[PDB]
Design an enzyme around this catalytic site. Structure first.
Site, PDB file in Angstrom:
ATOM      1  N   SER A  28       0.823  -1.269   0.118  1.00  9.87           N
ATOM      2  CA  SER A  28       0.051   0.115  -0.120  1.00  9.87           C
ATOM      3  C   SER A  28       0.979   1.242  -0.095  1.00  9.87           C
ATOM      4  CB  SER A  28      -0.837  -0.038   1.177  1.00  9.87           C
ATOM      5  OG  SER A  28      -2.062   0.589   0.904  1.00  9.87           O
ATOM      6  N   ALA A  30       0.119   5.952   0.031  1.00 11.48           N
ATOM      7  CA  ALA A  30      -0.872   6.717   0.493  1.00 11.48           C
ATOM      8  C   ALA A  30      -1.894   7.292  -0.165  1.00 11.48           C
ATOM      9  CB  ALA A  30       0.122   7.977   0.908  1.00 11.48           C
ATOM     10  N   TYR A  31      -1.828   6.873  -1.648  1.00 16.66           N
ATOM     11  CA  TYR A  31      -2.698   7.308  -2.402  1.00 16.66           C
ATOM     12  C   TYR A  31      -3.595   6.044  -3.131  1.00 16.66           C
ATOM     13  CZ  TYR A  31       0.155  11.590  -2.428  1.00 16.66           C
ATOM     14  OH  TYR A  31       0.897  12.515  -1.780  1.00 16.66           O
ATOM     15  N   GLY A  32      -3.163   4.966  -2.771  1.00 15.41           N
ATOM     16  CA  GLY A  32      -3.738   3.893  -3.407  1.00 15.41           C
ATOM     17  C   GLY A  32      -3.081   2.430  -2.867  1.00 15.41           C
ATOM     18  N   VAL A  34      -2.282  -2.113  -3.732  1.00 14.75           N
ATOM     19  CA  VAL A  34      -2.016  -2.603  -4.798  1.00 14.75           C
ATOM     20  C   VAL A  34      -2.190  -4.315  -4.533  1.00 14.75           C
ATOM     21  CG1 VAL A  34      -0.355  -3.194  -6.574  1.00 14.75           C
ATOM     22  CG2 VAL A  34      -0.352  -0.977  -5.431  1.00 14.75           C
ATOM     23  N   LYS A  49      -4.314  -1.422  -8.925  1.00 18.51           N
ATOM     24  CA  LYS A  49      -4.268  -0.432  -7.958  1.00 18.51           C
ATOM     25  C   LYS A  49      -5.521   0.110  -7.738  1.00 18.51           C
ATOM     26  CE  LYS A  49      -1.882   3.853  -6.833  1.00 18.51           C
ATOM     27  NZ  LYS A  49      -0.991   4.973  -7.687  1.00 18.51           N
ATOM     28  N   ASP A 164       5.064   5.866 -10.743  1.00 20.06           N
ATOM     29  CA  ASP A 164       5.077   7.384 -10.412  1.00 20.06           C
ATOM     30  C   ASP A 164       4.965   7.170  -8.711  1.00 20.06           C
ATOM     31  OD1 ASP A 164       2.647   5.777 -10.200  1.00 20.06           O
ATOM     32  OD2 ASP A 164       1.294   7.591 -10.728  1.00 20.06           O
TER      33      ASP A 164
HETATM   34  C1  LIG Z   1      -1.079  -1.439 -10.322  1.00 21.10           C
HETATM   35  O1  LIG Z   1      -0.516  -0.469  -9.432  1.00 21.10           O
HETATM   36  C2  LIG Z   1      -0.004   0.761 -10.009  1.00 21.10           C
HETATM   37  C3  LIG Z   1      -0.938   1.362 -11.027  1.00 21.10           C
HETATM   38  C4  LIG Z   1      -0.267   2.572 -11.603  1.00 21.10           C
HETATM   39  C5  LIG Z   1       0.606   3.069 -11.085  1.00 21.10           C
HETATM   40  C6  LIG Z   1       1.172   2.466  -9.779  1.00 21.10           C
HETATM   41  C7  LIG Z   1       1.050   1.565  -9.287  1.00 21.10           C
HETATM   42  N1  LIG Z   1       1.832   1.023  -8.270  1.00 21.10           N
HETATM   43  C8  LIG Z   1       2.445  -0.360  -8.502  1.00 21.10           C
HETATM   44  C9  LIG Z   1       2.512  -1.020  -9.426  1.00 21.10           C
HETATM   45  C10 LIG Z   1       3.295  -2.352  -9.586  1.00 21.10           C
HETATM   46  C11 LIG Z   1       3.627  -3.012 -10.616  1.00 21.10           C
HETATM   47  N2  LIG Z   1       4.375  -4.174 -10.059  1.00 21.10           N
HETATM   48  N3  LIG Z   1       4.361  -3.572  -8.596  1.00 21.10           N
HETATM   49  C12 LIG Z   1       5.191  -4.348  -7.415  1.00 21.10           C
HETATM   50  C13 LIG Z   1       5.011  -5.806  -7.167  1.00 21.10           C
HETATM   51  C14 LIG Z   1       5.675  -6.400  -6.143  1.00 21.10           C
HETATM   52  C15 LIG Z   1       5.710  -7.766  -5.483  1.00 21.10           C
HETATM   53  O2  LIG Z   1       5.937  -7.918  -4.287  1.00 21.10           O
HETATM   54  N4  LIG Z   1       5.168  -8.815  -6.687  1.00 21.10           N
HETATM   55  C16 LIG Z   1       4.904 -10.381  -5.874  1.00 21.10           C
HETATM   56  C17 LIG Z   1       5.776 -11.168  -6.456  1.00 21.10           C
HETATM   57  O3  LIG Z   1       4.883 -11.651  -7.526  1.00 21.10           O
HETATM   58  C18 LIG Z   1       3.786 -10.704  -6.674  1.00 21.10           C
HETATM   59  S1  LIG Z   1       6.833  -4.991  -5.776  1.00 21.10           S
HETATM   60  C19 LIG Z   1       6.201  -3.936  -6.788  1.00 21.10           C
HETATM   61  C20 LIG Z   1       6.744  -2.387  -7.081  1.00 21.10           C
HETATM   62  C21 LIG Z   1       3.931  -2.683  -8.427  1.00 21.10           C
HETATM   63  C22 LIG Z   1       3.669  -1.811  -7.205  1.00 21.10           C
HETATM   64  C23 LIG Z   1       3.049  -0.764  -7.308  1.00 21.10           C
HETATM   65  F1  LIG Z   1       3.096   0.222  -6.228  1.00 21.10           F
HETATM   66  C1  LIG Z   2       5.737   7.901 -14.804  1.00 18.26           C
HETATM   67  C2  LIG Z   2       6.208   9.042 -14.675  1.00 18.26           C
HETATM   68  C3  LIG Z   2       5.858   9.688 -13.158  1.00 18.26           C
HETATM   69  C4  LIG Z   2       5.675  11.163 -13.141  1.00 18.26           C
HETATM   70  C5  LIG Z   2       6.189  11.766 -11.811  1.00 18.26           C
HETATM   71  C6  LIG Z   2       4.953  11.802 -11.062  1.00 18.26           C
HETATM   72  C7  LIG Z   2       4.827  11.121  -9.764  1.00 18.26           C
HETATM   73  C8  LIG Z   2       5.639  11.792  -8.756  1.00 18.26           C
HETATM   74  O1  LIG Z   2       5.618  13.230  -8.715  1.00 18.26           O
HETATM   75  C9  LIG Z   2       4.443  13.661  -8.357  1.00 18.26           C
HETATM   76  O2  LIG Z   2       4.061  15.085  -8.645  1.00 18.26           O
HETATM   77  C10 LIG Z   2       5.224  15.793  -8.757  1.00 18.26           C
HETATM   78  C11 LIG Z   2       6.114  15.784  -9.925  1.00 18.26           C
HETATM   79  O3  LIG Z   2       6.830  16.708 -10.262  1.00 18.26           O
HETATM   80  C12 LIG Z   2       6.079  15.571  -7.316  1.00 18.26           C
HETATM   81  O4  LIG Z   2       7.014  16.726  -7.047  1.00 18.26           O
HETATM   82  C13 LIG Z   2       5.232  15.006  -6.300  1.00 18.26           C
HETATM   83  O5  LIG Z   2       6.042  14.672  -5.103  1.00 18.26           O
HETATM   84  C14 LIG Z   2       4.525  13.653  -6.750  1.00 18.26           C
HETATM   85  O6  LIG Z   2       3.323  13.678  -6.063  1.00 18.26           O
END
Ligand SMILES: COc1ccccc1Nc1cc2cnn(-c3cc(C(=O)NC4COC4)sc3C)c2cc1F
Ligand SMILES: CCCCCCCCO[C@@H]1O[C@H](CO)[C@@H](O)[C@H](O)[C@H]1O
Ligand SMILES: CCCCCCCCO[C@@H]1O[C@H](CO)[C@@H](O)[C@H](O)[C@H]1O
Length: 341
Positions: A28, A30-32, A34, A49, A164
């Site tokens: 998890s 702060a904004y979502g 997973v 997510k 992001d």
């Molecule tokens: C859909 O979510 C998002 C959608 C849009 C933008 C951001 C996100 N966020 C986000 C996206 C992913 C994609 N892969 N992972 C991931 C999986 C891990 C893990 O432990 N996998 C196990 C080994 O097999 C299960 S670690 C890690 C960094 C993620 C984590 C995220 F926070």
């Molecule tokens: C996939 C490309 C991700 C683009 C970056 C956006 C996610 C992190 O950047 C976001 O917005 C601002 C970006 O200037 C940051 O300063 C903030 O801290 C964050 O909320």
């Protein structure tokens, strides 16, 4: 409209289409939150997510819109991309949940340096992928501004994708360009190059480069390595206090990077010296970095694509939560998935 089903995972209620089975919480932010899921349509595991409180305030709404519009634009192997966007809502009135679907990675980069002992070839490949995706992001006029290990997802194949927002399930300041911590408010794209330089140093040595305890301790650590800024840089700092503290520190000569990173690939040391430059005008860009001899085994200029221009004009508008929500709904309904291989 597909068939949705409802289940509860960690005090959170999930309503996802039937095609995604075996929901398994990963972490998890702060904004979502997973989860891992099996995509019955493709036979591959994916990450889902669920945005937390997406339309609970003006800030949340704009943020939700921001993420949807951005992720819908990112089409690059080293940048997280959208495989699907859905909401159980059947109408704009009934709209209050947003789910994003991407590839499933294995871990984030701080869950890898925690093992340490990364080979030099491993650092070439991992940093090359970051720069390669960084070049694509910067060509869209986007600054990440928060690059850190938790925003870099990696597979056991060693494939990397820039997120992001990462999982908090590694202080941000340790990787911040000094101008951000000074509050310059006119940041260059190379603020991300500084962060990359901090991450590279960590992969090679196994220790945080600048583990500063706060923003003031953070700058003293940066100065001990790069050295006190010259006269040409000092004249550009308008803050008397900031200028007072910087000059107040006993002057420190620039350290010999070759000694600080002794044992490392001399080509890697040369790159670090080009990223960890105080003057952001003199920092190597992402595109320049991909041409450094350090990435000779991976550099392919005909396979380092740029991005279509990104319309960021919405970032200045001050709209009502309802308008931010309708625009987000418009982006949900209009999403076109990428074709299955
Ligand atoms: C859909 O979510 C998002 C959608 C849009 C933008 C951001 C996100 N966020 C986000 C996206 C992913 C994609 N892969 N992972 C991931 C999986 C891990 C893990 O432990 N996998 C196990 C080994 O097999 C299960 S670690 C890690 C960094 C993620 C984590 C995220 F926070
Ligand atoms: C996939 C490309 C991700 C683009 C970056 C956006 C996610 C992190 O950047 C976001 O917005 C601002 C970006 O200037 C940051 O300063 C903030 O801290 C964050 O909320
Ligand atoms: C305590 C360490 C001093 C930090 C000096 C930071 C110098 C950053 O560099 C500066 O970045 C500015 C934008 O942020 C640009 O406007 C300037 O042209 C550039 O020199």
């Amino acid at each position: 409209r597909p068939t949705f089903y409802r289940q509860e995972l960690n005090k959170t209620i999930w309503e996802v289409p039937e095609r995604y089975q075996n929901l398994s919480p990963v972490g998890s932010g702060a904004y979502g939150s997973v989860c891992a899921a099996f995509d019955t349509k493709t036979g591959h595991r994916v990450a889902v997510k669920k945005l937390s409180r997406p339309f609970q305030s003006i800030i949340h709404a704009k943020r939700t819109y921001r993420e949807l519009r951005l992720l819908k634009h990112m089409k690059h192997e080293n940048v997280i991309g959208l495989l699907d966007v859905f909401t159980p809502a059947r109408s704009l009135e009934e709209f209050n949940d947003v789910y994003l679907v991407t590839h499933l990675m294995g871990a984030d980069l701080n869950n890898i340096v925690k093992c340490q002992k990364l080979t030099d070839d491993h650092v070439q490949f991992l940093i090359y992928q970051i720069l390669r995706g960084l070049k694509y992001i910067h060509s869209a006029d986007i600054i990440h501004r928060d690059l850190k290990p938790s925003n870099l997802a990696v597979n056991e194949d060693c494939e990397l994708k820039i997120l992001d927002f990462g999982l908090a399930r590694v202080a941000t300041r340790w990787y911040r360009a000094p101008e951000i911590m000074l509050n310059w408010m006119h940041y260059n794209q190379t603020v991300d190059i500084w962060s990359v330089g901090c991450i590279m140093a960590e992969l090679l040595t196994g220790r945080t480069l600048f583990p500063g305890t706060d923003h003031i301790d953070q700058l003293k650590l940066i100065l001990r390595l790069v050295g006190t800024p010259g006269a040409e840089l000092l004249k550009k700092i308008s803050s008397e206090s900031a200028r007072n503290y910087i000059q107040s520190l006993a002057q420190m000569p620039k350290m010999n990077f070759a000694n600080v990173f002794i044992g490392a690939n001399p080509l890697a040391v040369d790159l670090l010296e080009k990223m960890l430059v105080l003057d952001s005008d003199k920092r190597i860009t992402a595109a320049q970095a991909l041409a450094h001899a350090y990435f000779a085994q991976y550099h392919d200029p005909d396979d380092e694509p740029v991005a279509d221009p990104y319309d960021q004009s919405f970032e200045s508008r001050d709209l009502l939560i309802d308008e931010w929500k309708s625009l987000t709904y418009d982006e949900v309904i209009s999403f076109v998935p990428p074709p299955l291989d």
